[PDB]
Ligand binder design. Structure first.
Ligand SMILES: [Cl-]
Ligand SMILES: [Cl-]
Ligand SMILES: [Cl-]
Ligand SMILES: [Cl-]
Lengths: 361, 361, 361, 361
């Protein structure tokens, strides 16, 4: 079969989301998705990807991934890579539909049928999560302090204030809840280290993106004082960035976002490499439903998948969703992703579509 | 003063080029430029930069550079960074116009009034260049071989064929010409090393982008066998990527493209850092006239600028150009860049413009 | 324009201070300043700088900095460098006056309009500072013990005595005050490490110059045990010394004194390099008013400036001073520094001046 | 005994030279010397050293060396260190006179009674030197090329021209002459490496100061390609700079100048440390007669002294000189240096003297 058209879809009600639909001459359409800079990525999909992939065999997934790597903008989570990643997800959806297999199977099998999930007044939230069988939560109480000083400094009183949610959670539920801390790369090295040390009494599970992930050797300074492993990083793209992270000797939980890192194609390889370092992987969500679903496929396959993040309107965008039951998530049934865009989407949302085909490229 | 409008300009006759014009409430308009993915970068300029910079003081150059660094797509030469870089160049143009000073002065002074240039049948070309006082030339005779095997392999007969231009140049002009070799990041490590060793007899000046610049630690393997210093890399963005390059201990000639690396703002800092390593800088051109001009300003200021690359239609795009005389290049006279878009541009070219202002963001 | 005369000024009432005035043929006079060895630096200014700079264009700042680097005495804070640094500050003052711009603007813009300051019975002092909105203080209670043994040893009773001010401050104001510790490079490695460990309970903010900064690799031993980041070092000169510091992997807060390190020219480059390491800069004062002012310009520009040290007679030396309001400091208004030597100086002080011109060199 | 007066002496006919005379209450006067910035160092001697040493016991040599180390300007060859070094040489002269022993004896004995020397149309010079029994010569034919480009670049034709003296020397005398190459720290890293490789055919003995000695880790890059050991460096001061050099793993011949590095006191310790690395020392001269003489004392004592550089008017400045016979140099006879300032100096030269005593400090 051959790719005939690239279709991009946006909704005015959710401006960060972009869907990429890959049509074929066999009537099999693949669905992909990415998040942030939707208009920019959309332009890229039609300007750059379309003339390179119209007429091509979509089953040559590894080759197509290689053919879209840019002279510029590689090893990053920039617009080009986000576009490439969304396209790659759609190719896996096509491959699944063509073989009548779930993506998890095509990755090498369901190593598990479901996986533990985590979600993002802290003590009441903690109680509520536990009762629903969820035993991990991620919070980011230092972001407000970071914005005040652009991450160069935190006063001890502001630090103490930001520790209060941890004390509240521990007072409420004790050791029953894993607490992950997200820093959103907002801090410079010294205050990051200061905050890390201060978190020691609270038995935190991981410290995610404690500094900007642009010179990874700096992470060794952080690992030397951090009471929790470094979680890094949804902001990194390609297996080459992850080689660099692993070679620091400071890597902990390996985080990636399949729509930001080069697709399921790069993600599956990053995961197998992380396993060689005896480290786990945790694919990023809380963006769109397709990324949640495709990430769940990866998490059911990868032997070193630790947890699959999930959201505590998705139902109006797509035909089916991953299901969460007693704190565990699994994929919707069926070939490929196990979902498509909802038929009623243009009546619930304000939809814009753009097409490329043989005539337009 | 305050930024009032962002204007982007493209020409159908040169699809890779994008101009960014920053208008102010004082009637001072700054001109910036970047290359590759013009439509994509244009979308980004209006989607991301405009709502962040309309109403802002353009003289806070370092702050504006900081404020545009993305959560994703940083430390790269991707679309976001290219947009940011073009914008940054325009800010320097404004700063120059507001102070009635050339950009080279605002960077810290004219450390030289002109700088040596280089240009990209090889023996006849060499003779011709020398007669015009140009004593360096850059060639890329291995690219065809790379495309054949996607850079995994080169046969000895193909290697021998690609060495012929070097033999021709040396036979014609002997030691009078520096020969730079560009590889365009097309090769994997092993054939790159094989080619490097084979170039030994030809006394090459630098070996530019011999492999992909995505895991820089691999450059140590190359430096161990290369008869010429590594030139790297116009494909790298931000001073953080250049910190990583310098820390390999394999850095040679530090190459950057001001419109791909974060602007004059990041470029000037990369250059001063390279000097701390006793290494030179060589700003990339042969793209558009504004990048050539702004690069020349940087090259006249930076004490460690080694050469300024130049082209052997520019005249119809802008009002003035850098001048080359006896193999040396200098800036056009005047404040800022010393150039603006040509008044007659819409009659020579097929021009498209897009605007953002307070009403549209 | 061209430099016509170099003028040096000293006052008998403040023997450590030296001013350098750079006169031009356009009547624009630049003011610079340095501290320590005033007579020696003055001799150097006339013996070495004058014959090299009379007749030169002062706007070629980077070039003039390069031209004054000595065959001997480089990469240091010695007399030659102090002279060069004072001269460099005067060049920036000229550049500002010629363009009608504050120095902070010429460095790349006001990234902030004001910056947090710190000042040097400890509990009462702490209370007083907080009420004036100052939330950081620097103390050096170990110096007396160091002098007793030339820094080779501290008895446990003497250590305990030197910890008392920290206990007093914490008892009085708790976590509301950052406490910086200065050691003035008075200690050898082992007692420095012993003292560092003993400071753990007091949550110190930084440990400044804990040992002599002459073999920087020794700092790794200190960083391995110190509960606070290393602050280093006002005693280091040139970006090359700071490259060496950064490459230890033990660098913390990057301290410099613009009049000891090579001027605003070297300082601005040291700051941008430190940012590549995700570290902050803190320019040294409590010397003379011109250094305080020029340092404040740097601190308003450098995105990674953390704090600007200040004094808790300046008013009789110069025409205007940086202003402190609610613990924040900013520059005086106007082009260049925004200050000149006070017209009434020869009536408040015992003034000595020396001149070099075309006739004397 | 106690120091009573410090006397400095300069001659208008040799502006780079400075003598320091240390008078005592026992009538024993010590003679020291340094080179470069004579007026500046003279000011320092009276401003800084005098008030610290008048009234002190000159025999406490190690203690006095320690007491003069500056808060600023240490680990350098700057004015303060040059002053300290000249003073230290005078202390050794006093110690010698007080004990009726040559300085070489006080250092630990005459390990040799004489040492090989070297001197600085090349082929005719080589012949002449050999006939006088001198079998090493140092040349610096690359300096003119360095000045042209401030050390950033050398054209192949200029490189070829600078190699001609080596070809001339080898054609004339073959392998009979060791050829040392001095670069005077004039080159950046890349051209330094290029020049080093090009010198391979000429069997050079050492490559001295191939780059600036300000970030010594860069020397590893040079050592990886140099066909001769690195000679470094007369520009470095204190044993701490030499620790840094040794720790690079690239050190070769250890060069120092006793009047630039901290005196015989630091020099003797640098030499013993270099021996621990199985490396030789070569004390710098061709400055003044006192430095030549004191260096020769060091060279006769230090078991790892390799050669003592010498000049091919000294006789009118001092009472006695080191003697060269058949390419070997030895000290003049007598206690201390074995020389004093010539009695007739004020009639051959234009002499200026300055004094400090108990009344003036
Ligand atoms: Cl590891
Ligand atoms: Cl290096
Ligand atoms: Cl570090
Ligand atoms: Cl060694």
């Amino acid at each position: 079969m051959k790719i005939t058209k690239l279709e991009t879809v946006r909704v005015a009600e959710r401006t960060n989301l972009l869907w990429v639909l890959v049509h074929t001459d066999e009537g099999i359409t693949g669905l992909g998705e990415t998040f942030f800079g939707a208009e920019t990525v959309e332009t890229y999909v039609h300007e750059y990807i379309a003339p390179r992939v119209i007429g091509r065999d979509p089953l040559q997934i590894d080759l197509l991934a290689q053919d879209l790597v840019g002279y510029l903008g590689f090893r990053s989570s920039g617009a080009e890579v986000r576009g490439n990643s969304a396209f790659d997800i759609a190719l896996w959806d096509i491959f699944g539909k063509a073989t009548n297999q779930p993506i998890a199977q095509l990755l090498g099998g369901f190593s598990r049928r479901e996986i533990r999930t985590y979600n993002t007044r802290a003590d009441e939230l903690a109680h509520s999560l536990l009762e629903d069988g969820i035993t991990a939560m991620k919070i980011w109480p230092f972001d407000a302090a970071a914005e005040k000083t652009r991450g160069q400094y935190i006063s001890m009183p502001d630090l103490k204030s930001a520790l209060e949610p941890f004390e509240k959670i521990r007072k409420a539920v004790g050791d029953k809840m894993d607490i992950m801390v997200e820093f959103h790369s907002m801090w410079q090295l010294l205050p990051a280290m200061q905050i890390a040390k201060a978190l020691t009494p609270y038995q935190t599970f991981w410290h995610e993106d404690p500094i900007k992930m642009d010179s990874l050797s700096s992470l060794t300074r952080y690992a030397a004082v951090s009471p929790a492993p470094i979680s890094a990083s949804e902001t990194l793209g390609s297996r080459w960035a992850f080689r660099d992270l692993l070679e620091t000797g400071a890597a902990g939980v390996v985080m990636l976002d399949i729509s930001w890192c080069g697709g399921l194609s790069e993600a599956r390889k990053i995961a197998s490499m992380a396993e060689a370092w005896h480290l786990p992987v945790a694919p990023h969500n809380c963006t769109g439903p397709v990324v949640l679903c495709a990430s769940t496929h990866l998490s059911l396959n990868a032997p070193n998948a630790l947890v699959q993040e999930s959201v505590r309107w998705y139902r109006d965008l797509v035909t089916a969703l991953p299901e969460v039951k007693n704190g565990m998530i699994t994929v919707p049934p069926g070939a490929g992703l196990g979902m498509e865009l909802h038929p009623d989407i243009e009546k619930t949302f304000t939809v814009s579509r753009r097409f490329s085909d043989a005539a337009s490229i």
